[PDB]
Structure formats: structure tokens, C-alpha cells
Amino acid sequence: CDDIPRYENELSLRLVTSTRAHAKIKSIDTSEAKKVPGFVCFISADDVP
Amino acid sequence: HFYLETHCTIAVPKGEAGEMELFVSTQNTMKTQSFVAKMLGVPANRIVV
Amino acid sequence: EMGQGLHTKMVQVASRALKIPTSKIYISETSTNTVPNTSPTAASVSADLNGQAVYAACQTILKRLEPYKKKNPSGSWEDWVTAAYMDTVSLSATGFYRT
Amino acid sequence: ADKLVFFVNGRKVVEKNADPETTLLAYLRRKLGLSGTKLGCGEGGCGACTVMLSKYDRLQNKIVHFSANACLAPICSLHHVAVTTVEGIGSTKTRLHPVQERIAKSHGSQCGFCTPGIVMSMYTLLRNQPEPTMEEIENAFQGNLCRCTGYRPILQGFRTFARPSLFKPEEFTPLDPTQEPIFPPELLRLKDTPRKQLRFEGERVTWIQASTLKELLDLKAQHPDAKLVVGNTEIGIEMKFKNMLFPMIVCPAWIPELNSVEHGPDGISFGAACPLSIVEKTLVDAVAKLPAQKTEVFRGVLEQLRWFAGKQVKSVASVGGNIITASPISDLNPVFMASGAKLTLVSRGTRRTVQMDHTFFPGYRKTLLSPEEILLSIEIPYSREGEYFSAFKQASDIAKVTSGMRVLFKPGTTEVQELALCYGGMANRTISALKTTQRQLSKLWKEELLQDVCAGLAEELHLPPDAPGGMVDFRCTLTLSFFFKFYLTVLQKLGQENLEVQLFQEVPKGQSEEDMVGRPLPHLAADMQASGEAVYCDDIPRYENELSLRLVTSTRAHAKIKSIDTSEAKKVPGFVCFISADDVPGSNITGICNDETVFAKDKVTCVGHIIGAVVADTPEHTQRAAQGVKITYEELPAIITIEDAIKNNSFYGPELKIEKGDLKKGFSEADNVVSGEIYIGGQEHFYLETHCTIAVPKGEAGEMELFVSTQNTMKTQSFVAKMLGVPANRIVVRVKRMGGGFGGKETRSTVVSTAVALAAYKTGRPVRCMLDRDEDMLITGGRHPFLARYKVGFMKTGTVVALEVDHFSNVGNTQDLSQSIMERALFHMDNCYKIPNIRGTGRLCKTNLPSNTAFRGFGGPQGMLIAECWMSEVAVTCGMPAEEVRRKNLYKEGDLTHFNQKLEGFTLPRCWEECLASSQYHARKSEVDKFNKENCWKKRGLCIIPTKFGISFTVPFLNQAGALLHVYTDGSVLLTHGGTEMGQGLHTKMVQVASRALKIPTSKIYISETSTNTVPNTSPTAASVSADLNGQAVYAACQTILKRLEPYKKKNPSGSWEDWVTAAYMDTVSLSATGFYRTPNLGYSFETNSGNPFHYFSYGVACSEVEIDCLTGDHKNLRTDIVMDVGSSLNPAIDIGQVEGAFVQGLGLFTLEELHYSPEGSLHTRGPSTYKIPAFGSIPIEFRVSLLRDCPNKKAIYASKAVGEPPLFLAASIFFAIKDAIRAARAQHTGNNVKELFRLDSPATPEKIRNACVDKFTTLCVTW
Ligand SMILES: Cc1cc2nc3c(=O)[nH]c(=O)nc-3n(C[C@H](O)[C@H](O)[C@H](O)COP(=O)(O)OP(=O)(O)OC[C@H]3O[C@@H](n4cnc5c(N)ncnc54)[C@H](O)[C@@H]3O)c2cc1C
């Protein structure tokens, strides 16, 4: 599958996941991540249209 | 399960009229189609898997 | 195909029903605008159900061809196809099955 | 100073490393992947590459906006400039901008390609001048050409912005210009922080952007071979096409001193860098604010600049440039020279001041400049009291001619103090009068000066018949006729010799709001074409390892091939490998009657034919490699011309013929016999998207998938599979759309796909290639020209009785389709006349010219033109009226054609009668001779022509097609069918139909692309039947679905359509079905003259007024009314759109387009600059089209007739109306000549019209 070549503008993804077994979710902090080289954007539940 | 190829998805958007084409390691072709079309909010006939 | 020979079995069948060598028939990939509304590739029946469908479609083709086989019953299979083409018959067909 | 920085659409770009050779388009297109700013010529005048530059001024501390073509503009010019693109103003994923939506909704975008270009042209206008005049809009568009639409809808959609029906302009959204996007606030923070000079370094060139005048001058003084670039509209051409390479460029341009305007005591003075566009602007108003005699030279400069060229170019090229560039054909230099203009030259320690005169250009593109001297400024002079000036240019590096003329008299009298006549295009360089000028000095503006002048004008600038450019006595005459024009318009300025709409039919009262068949719904994708978003071909992204190709081609007309040398090419950076004929692993003998070779082997047969190709990493590298491989040939003899061919006995299989009667009988039985020959010229497809092919090899079991701009899906598949040597079922070809095809992509497309395929096969990774305008016009080739000779016998009533006609067709160097074309020719010699004894033949001539192919028309439009010639030669020999004669020998309902097929339900006389009605021929005719009586030097003409066109493929077994319909579990439908969209609404019609048959809203059905594993074995998307055949197939498939559903509709007959589908699904029915169709009872035999070749006929009739200027050879295209039978149109907006387009293409073919070939056979004529297709400017003044009402056609899908081609012939009318005014000017200046019979050839150009308008001057020139 991933054996199929890139295109020349293709991004990678990789998805973020809950480290507790039942809880409410008090807020999300994206700041440390926008420092990484090549970072494009963080997708979340508020974005599905 | 431990299959050797683990899961995955190259998704390629064409950009006119919501079309998108997806290359996907699945047993269930139908469903990969509709729940993508549901989440996106478009007619099934713009999706090809 | 999850590596369990569905494709190789699907070929075997269609080779037989049509009576042309396995070598001459190719399957390339599976997709949702070649044949829509498909059940999960699932509970062992995956062989049998497509098995059937492939058959039917096979049969509708051979009916279409009879006339040209009749008129030249010792010629090539290529012979009967160039033939039907120029006379104006469909060479593309669907095929379905329910248990 | 290294980093260049500019902005694109709002965002900043900081490009560390620019190579002065990368052009803005291209940065745009393939570095920041914004497609949709398209490439159309690369040569400057198609404008599909148009964008908008906004920058901050500094001198008048203002922010300015202009248009420019991005195919030409180097990125090193663009420091600190901001670019707006098509996808900058608006999009379908937000709001379209009103320039966008109106051009879409008013039917102005059929194929769709020239669309962003026109949109920006318009968009910029508005941003400078926010409520313009219908004249100013008229006129943004010199820069932009479209092929599919004939212009009318464009202008009528935008007319809206300025001061039983088809689109509602009152529903358009309104437009608030406070809402366009803001000038980036970040330049502007710059603007203070002052310029210093910059240097960028490239792979081959070095670019120094200079900043003071001091740094220019020093630079040039220590490196005098350094090349000035300013507008780049010159160098750009030279570096791309005449493979020149100047390694060090300095661009002035920033320099305050070279950009200044100044109001002297004496004339106005302009900095060399200034663009034309502002020279104009200056003059334009300073003429209107000023005593109308100082302004005599000004009025001339402006006079040339209207017909110079068009806005995207005027806003970049400098006067400086034009003056020094110095071509033979500058239109500016004559005027400046005749003007005696005033140049200011400088170097470091140099301050020369020369008056322009014959002396300034010594030789071929040279001037008086020394290498270290630059031009500072020009000064155009006020005119003194009793000093008079005009300028002339006439149109369609040598030919045409352009002139500046000046005279001054001894004051308060006629006399002649000074006189100078300067002419472009008659020599090497811009020349002066002068022997002739001398002698005229102190005479009087009177008759025997007018003679002495014209006498000397013929001797001095006499032309040898070998002189290059050709054309000689046109080129001649013009010299006098301009003078004569001039003489007259002097006189006038003293004591002065006095004597003293579109309509169609409404749908049924009854029928549903959401049945859409018959209603005028706009092209399924015009929004997205207008918006930039629709993806055409090379528009499809790269992959990350994808190579480019580009193919190598024979520079001789017939020769053996002694050997190939690849050495110079392997030196280029990124070079991958050279593919040749020894590499196909399959079969090198392809083409379509197996005549031709995939790559040449052992010998080359025309001007060239593919020898091989080179493979690299970028396309500019592709170029340099091409360039690189050098071949060595030994040279055999050449057949070229139609004759030869015959004088040699060539050609292509045995003489075709049709016969009926006897005939020996007519001619003996007859009153008069005429007897003539005429020649019809060839023609270029010029679609906007040129050819091409992304080929992608998968790598297991030979599979490959190809994305291809074609009309013929099938064939692209097999001849790829043949050449490769694998089973057809490993090949898949897909077409989503095209920038137009008109036949030109029915077959020839394969020549490219084939090559590309192999490069992928070899290297194992994707490869694409797409032609530049210049390669494409060579390689693919044209419509067929014809020579015909005839003989026609007739009574003195005008009733015709016998006719005999011989055709040949020049073919080229492979058979191809050429046979089927000839046949269709023969089927059409009758046009619309019954004619009881008749013999027509034709031959197919072998030549060393590239192979001619299929073009809208298919030979039909060649004569029906022959006969129709012949015809008006009858009517003239009788003594007339021409109307009465045609009316007189019309087929009538139920007769039969010379091939014995019955004419049933024959509409033609209703089209006839109903046209002369509305058009009102008489009185108009009378009103015309009247103008002819009162005008000496301009004349007018009027004509009315018929036409009938058989519909259906001639090989009968091509009349078939087929489709595939899926219904998803959610209600949505998925349609595909055999045929392909070239921007002509097939898809939109295919939807309309299926919406109806299934009785669900148009909105719910989608079609996505066309392909060879959705529906195999498909006929070319070709001879107008493409609608009807897929029409049928779609139907069938529709029906099989509704049968399947009945049961579930029955059981719940008031539920939703979604209801019936979830329903059938769970009960276990198929929701996917096929569908097919054959046209029945077809087949004509040639030797038996029987049986049935067509299925029905299209009919129609046209009426045109023209007026010529018989001094120059130019004409206006005054009015034109058509009435067309379409049956019951599927979509009257798209038909019509179809009508007007085709009609305009006839315009081109009969009056405007000419190809030229060197004597020994290399095509000379290769881009929008030398091949002039018809422009916004060229369409008829009033243009009236009407579909014919109440007349259903029961032999074809829901009552409709075919509409593609028939109407293109009707332009005929403009040709004959043009032959008519010719009569009238011959009869004034020939003294007498009774009933003339004179040779007129197609295409009727300025040269050929002028030439045949005989008089005083033609006679003085008498004796490539
Ligand atoms: C689409 C199109 C249509 C055209 N139509 C016409 C037409 O209708 N009539 C016509 O006459 N021409 C026409 N042209 C030519 C165009 O007018 C010229 O290219 C323009 O005049 C050149 O200005 P430039 O800034 O591009 O010069 P560049 O292209 O930058 O280079 C031009 C020459 O100027 C030189 N130069 C030398 N000294 C100086 C100096 N002192 N100051 C400035 N430049 C100097 C450079 O060496 C170079 O040779 C047309 C061109 C295009 C492609």
C-alpha cells in the first residue's frame, strides 16, 4: 500500500490518543507542537464539516 | 490479529465537486465509502475506494 | 484479496465457463465503481458468492456469441470476437447472485 | 544581494536562489503548484497566461495595477512586486467573484481553457476604472483569444457592468469593490528602507538589477557585451525560439532618469524604459487638451498604437525596446523617422544628440549606437503651422507594410518646403522616400505631383520576384495606395475638393419543473472552469519521481539517415537517456492502415516525423538535451505540391467515383457551357490545450495507466498495447476533459502517447510530456486542401442540366482517415440542388508533407463550396438575380440524391423562406447598390446560402455505443458512457436525459470521467453523433433499472426514491447495470450505387453583409442572420453555442487563416503571431441566430437533431458576399467588362482581395 509512490506534495498524518480509561477532557494544548520543523496543522473534532 | 501489513490510507482529493479517491487496506469496501461520505457530508457518488 | 487465492479461484472458474485458457483472462483490482454495493469480503462465502456472479456474467457473454460460433464452428475464439464486434454486439456485461 | 522576495496571492515568497531563466508561470505553475494559469502559445499573443501585477510606485507615491502575461515575465524582474492570480479573486469553495460568475452563467465558457485568462483581463479593468464604457471593455480583449465560443456570449455577459429567453441577468450578484483583497501591508513597511543593486546567479546566466544611472553606466563601460533587458518581450522570444544565450544581463528599469516624462517648449520627452502603455495615456489626453495643430504627430503615434498588440504587452514593453530592437516591421520606427524624432544617447563621459533619419539604421537589426552607449530618451515633436501627418499599417522579418508620412508648406500657401515618406517592411530596415521625395520639392499639391510620386514609388522600391516574404505586387501596390490615401486627406485640410439577438422555442405548458430536457441549463462545470478549479491535464500533479519527455524531429523533407550523435546531450545536467527506434520491444509499425512508424528507421519521409526522444528531469533540461542530439542525412528527391503528385503519378489507391444519368445527353441538350478550376486552402485546429500524456507504469504484469487528451479512447489503447507487445487488458486509458479537439485529436494523439508510454516502460517510473505551440503545429498537421476542375451545363432560365467535377485532396505521408474524407466530399457536391446527370471523381495524393487528418467538417465543407461557385457563375452568365436561381433548383420533398437516398421530411425550404423574412434581404439588397453608387473607394456585398449535411458515421459499424450506471445505497447515481467531453456539453446533455428517464432531479446524478474499463470498445468521440449514440445507451441502462424497481414502487407508490432503493437493496436486487445501442439499417455500396449511407440530414441557411476597403484589402463584417434546423433541441443554450462557434470557424477557413511552406517543404508558419485566427474584433457586427420551431425528428433520442458540424459551412455567405463587392469595384475602375468570370481562391485574405480590385495602381506593378 504505502508501496505506492508519493506525490510530490503529499503530507503524512499520525493521530493522538487517550492516555486514560474514562474521563472528562479539560483542555488541549497545541503550543509545544507548532515549534517542530515542517508542522502543518492539528485536526480535531471541531473540524469535520 | 497480527497480520503483517498493518492498517492504512492514501487519500487523494481531486478538488472539483467534492471528489476524492482512496487507496485502502480493507475487507469492507462499501462501508469504507459511506462512512467517509457521511463524515464529509457529501453524496456517495463522489467517493471512490 | 487478502492472500487466500480468491483471485486465482475467480480466474479458474471463468476460464472454464468460457472455455479459453487461464492465461488469456486478467483481474487487476477491486473497486466501488466497477461494481457497487458489495458485502464485506468475509465469512468464507466470499468464494461461492463471487463464484456465482462471475459465472452468470460469463454465460451472458456466451449467449451473445453463439450465432458467430455456429456460423464458423472450427475457427479461433479471436475469430468469433472480431466477428461479433463488426456485426454490432455488446462485449461488456454485468452479473449477479443471491443465496 | 541575493534573496528575491515577492508576493503571490497575499502570501510572501522568499526564494533564496533564483535562476534568471525561470519564467513567472512555471514558478507559479510548478513550484507553488497553482494550476489554472494556463500555457497557450508561450509566444505572447493568446493571453491564457494572464495575471495581475500590483506594485507601489515611489515616483508618484501611488499604488498601481496592471495585466501582464506571465509566460514571458522572468522572475528576476519581479522583486517586491505582488501577484494576483485566477485563484486569487474567488472560488467555489467560498464565493465566486462576480467577474467569475457572470462569465459562467451567461454561457461564455464551453471548453473552458481560455477562461481564467479572460477573467483576469476583465478583473483588472475594473480595478482601474470601476464603471467602464462598452468601448473600453471591447478592448481589454485584443490580448485574449477563444476558439470554441465565437465571442458573443462573453461580451453580452459582461456588457452588464457598464455605463422566450436564455439567462437572467437580473439575478446576478452585485459587487462591492470595497471587498477585493488588500495591498499587502508588508511591502509599504519596505518602501522607505532604499534600493541597492542586486545580483542573482543562475545555471547559465547572471542577472544584475541596477539601481542608480551611475551604476548602469559603469557596468556597461567595463563589460560592453552585457545585455540590457527591460520588458523582455523581445529577448524572451529570442532565447526560447532561436536558441540564443546571452550570459550576462543587466536590467535598468528601476532608474528614475529612464522613466521620466517631461513637457518641453517643443515636444514631449519620454524615458526609454517607459511602457508603451504610458506613452499612450500621455498623448491620449494631452491631444484632447491642446490646439489641434501642434498635435499632428501625436495623432499618428496613437494611430499606430491601437492596432499594436493589446494590453498585457503594452503594459510591459518600452518605447526604448522597440526603437533599438530594431525589426524591419516596427510600426513605430517609420513614424519616428518620418517625424524626424530626437534621441538622447549616453555612455560614461558621452552626451550625443541625434535627429532620427535614414542614417540611423545601417544594416540588419543594427543602429548608430556604440557598444558602451545606452539610449536615454526619445522626444516626439509638436507640429508647426501648416505641417501635416498620417500613419498607415496594414495587416491580416518581412511583409505587410507600415508607414509614416510628413509634409510642410511654404507658409500661408500650398507649395512644399519639406517632404518625407518612410516605409516599414519593404526592405532590410526602416527606409526613406528619398529620390522621389527630392524631385517633388517646391511644386504644388496638385494632380501631376500625385502622378510623379507614384511613378517614383514604383521604380525606387522595386521588388525582385525572389525577394523574401513573397506576395510581391500586394506588397507593392500598398506603397502607392497609402500615398494616395495620404494625398487626399491633405487636401481635405485646406481648400478641399467638394462637389455637393438569438431565439428558440419554449417547453410545453404542462412539463415538470425538474424535467430539464429542452430547457437551457448551463454546462455542468462552467463555474469551476471559470474559477480555476477544473483540472485539465499536466494540471494533474507530479509524482515525486516523474520524468519529462520531449521528442526529436526531422529537419529534412525526404532523405536517408546516415547516423545519430548523442554526445553533446549527455553533458546536460539531469539528462536521463535517449529513446529510439531500436528500443520498442513490440512492433514499430503502427498507424491506422498500418502505413507509419512509431520511430523512424533508416529514412525520413516528411518535414519531420519522429526520429526519437530525450528524457530528463525538467522540461527546460528537456529542451537543452533535444538540442544536443545532432543527426547526418543524405538527401533523396521530394514530391510536395498537389501537381508533382500527378505529374509523377503518385498516390494512395484507385480513383473514387460516383455516377447517375448520362450526361452525354446533357451538354448536347444544353444552352451554355462553363468550365473553370479553383483552389481551397488548408487549415489548423488551434485548440487551446495542445496534445499530451502522463503515462504511469505499475510494474507487475505489464500494467500501465495513461492520462490522455484524446477523442479516441480505443485506439489510444490498442496501438499502445501493440507497440509494447502485451494483451489489451493490461492497458487502461482515461480522459476526464479536453481543451478542445475538433478532429485534430481523433487519431493523432496517439503519436505522442505512444512515445511517452515506452519511456515509462524503459525507465520504470512515470513520465509525462505536453507539446509547445510550435512543436504541435508542425508534427500533428492540418485539414486537407483541395484542387477541383469543373464543367457545368445549363439553360438560359438558369435551370441546370449536367455537371462534371474532379477532386484532389493533398494527403501527406501516411494514409490515415484520408479516404473516408474524400468519400464524404463526394456525398456533398450537390449541396442542395437536384441535377439529373452528374459525374464526380477524386484522387488521393502522396506527398512529403506531414499527414493531414480529421477536422470539423470531414471534407464536406469543401465544396459544397465547389458547386456553389460554379453556381453563382451560372446566375451571372444568365443575368441574374442570384436568389431566383438557387430557389429555382432545390431538391423538393421526397426527391432523391445522386446516391439514390430518399429526402424525407425535408425542412430546407421552410428554413429558406423563414430566413429571407426576418433578415429582410430585399430591401437590404436595394439599400446596398446605392452605397455602391455613392462610394468610389469602399463597396458592399450581400449573400444568402443553403446547406444539408448527412448525419452518421460512414463505416456503418461505428454507429454504436454503450454505458454503465450504478445506484448507491444512499440514493445517489453514478453515470459513465462511452464518449468524451471536449467542451460541447456532452456530459450536460447525458445528465439531462438520464434525469428525465429516471424521474429524479438533475442535481442527484453525477458523471466523473470517461474510461476503458468502465465501458470498453468505444467509437471515436466524433461525427456529431456522439450525442445520439450515447444518448441511447444511457437510456437503455436507465430502463433496465426502472424495471428492477417497479415491484417496490408498486408496494409503496407514494414514498421517496431513497425509499424504493433501501428497499430493493434489502430484498436483493441488482443496482448496477449496462446499456447499449446500434443505428439500424445502414450501408451504402459504391458499385451498385444503392443502399443507405446516412440516418437523417441537418439543414440550415445564412445571410451576410460585408463592406470592403478597396484601397487596402481589409473588410468589416457588417451583419449575419442564420436559421437552423436542430429538431427539438435537448438544450438550446448549448446548441447555438454550438451554432455560433462552428460559424465563426468557417469565418477563419474562408477568409483569415493561411498556412506557408518553404519551396522545399518545411512549414514556415508556427504561432498566434503568423497564424491569425479570428479575434473578438472579427465577428459580425450584428449577429442573429434562430433555431427552427415545431419540427420533431423521430429518428433520434427524444426528438433532437445533431448539431456539431453542419453549420460551419454557412460562413460561405461571407465569402460570396465578399466576391460580390469585388464585382462592384471591378466594374467602376475596369472601365467596362460585360459579365466577368474571375478566379477567386479560398481563403480570401487582404492580399487576394486587394490584388483582384483592379485600377490605376495595380497596373503600375504589372510591367519563399
Ligand atoms: C505579443 C506581441 C505583439 C507585438 N506587436 C508588435 C507590434 O504590433 N508592432 C511592433 O512594432 N512591435 C510589436 N511587438 C514588439 C514589442 O513592441 C517590443 O518587444 C517592445 O517594443 C520591446 O520593449 P522591451 O522592454 O521588451 O525590450 P526587451 O525585450 O527587454 O529587449 C529589447 C531590446 O532593447 C534593448 N535596449 C538597448 N538599449 C536599450 C536602452 N537604451 N534602453 C532600453 N532597452 C534597450 C535590448 O538590447 C533589447 O534588444 C510585439 C511583441 C509581442 C510579443
Ligand code: FES
Ligand atoms: S501569451 Fe502565454 S500562452 Fe499565449
Ligand code: FES
Ligand atoms: S472555451 Fe475558449 S478555447 Fe474553448
